[PDB]
């Protein structure tokens, strides 16, 4: 599927609150920090003889990912997130 | 029977796996040829 690098869309900004030009770009996730409470807890729990203590997911089924677009206003630099359907092929139409 | 020995058991008399054991194996595994660089007869 294709989606161009720009579109005119509603900015929720305090100043805009209008249809403005928005630069779209695909959403890539972060790096999964180590000082997150739920990673610290996991470390503390694995620390011991014990075993593996939490589950581990094997039984995948999905072969796709929902596409998320990060839009950014060109005059406010305010950002937003839109979601699309699942697809196997996605590129930005420069 | 297999309790008694690793070679044990089977509806025939067969080892199943190789008799060339490692050197870093443990007590109860070292039942065979222990650190074989070689096996078998050379020529006669």
């Amino acid at each position: 599927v294709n989606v161009p690098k720009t579109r005119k869309t509603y900015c929720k900004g305090k100043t805009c609150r209008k249809h403005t030009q928005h630069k779209v770009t695909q959403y890539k996730a972060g790096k999964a920090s180590l000082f997150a409470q739920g990673k610290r807890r996991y470390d503390r729990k694995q620390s011991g003889f014990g075993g593996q203590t939490k589950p581990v997911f094997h039984k995948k089924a999905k072969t796709t990912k929902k596409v998320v677009l990060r839009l950014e206003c060109v005059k406010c630099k305010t950002r937003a997130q839109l979601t699309l359907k699942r697809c196997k092929h996605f590129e930005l139409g420069g | 029977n297999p309790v008694d020995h690793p070679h044990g058991g089977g509806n025939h008399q067969h080892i199943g796996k190789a008799s060339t054991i490692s050197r870093g194996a443990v007590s109860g595994q070292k039942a065979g040829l222990i650190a074989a660089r070689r096996t078998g007869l050379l020529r006669g």
Partner: protein, 50 residues
């Protein structure tokens, strides 16, 4: 599982050596001055079976 006879040979108790009829430990004599310097003479009294 059980333990194999190789594993049971290490505590002994039936796999010991049978040591009643043995004359003794066969061992050269101790290294002393007579044997580091010059020599010393000895004599055989009997050949026996161990």
């Amino acid at each position: 599982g059980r333990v194999i006879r190789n594993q049971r040979k290490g505590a002994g108790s039936i796999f010991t050596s049978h040591t009643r009829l043995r004359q003794g430990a066969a061992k050269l004599r101790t290294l002393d001055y007579a044997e580091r310097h010059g020599y010393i003479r000895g004599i055989v009294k009997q050949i026996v079976h161990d």
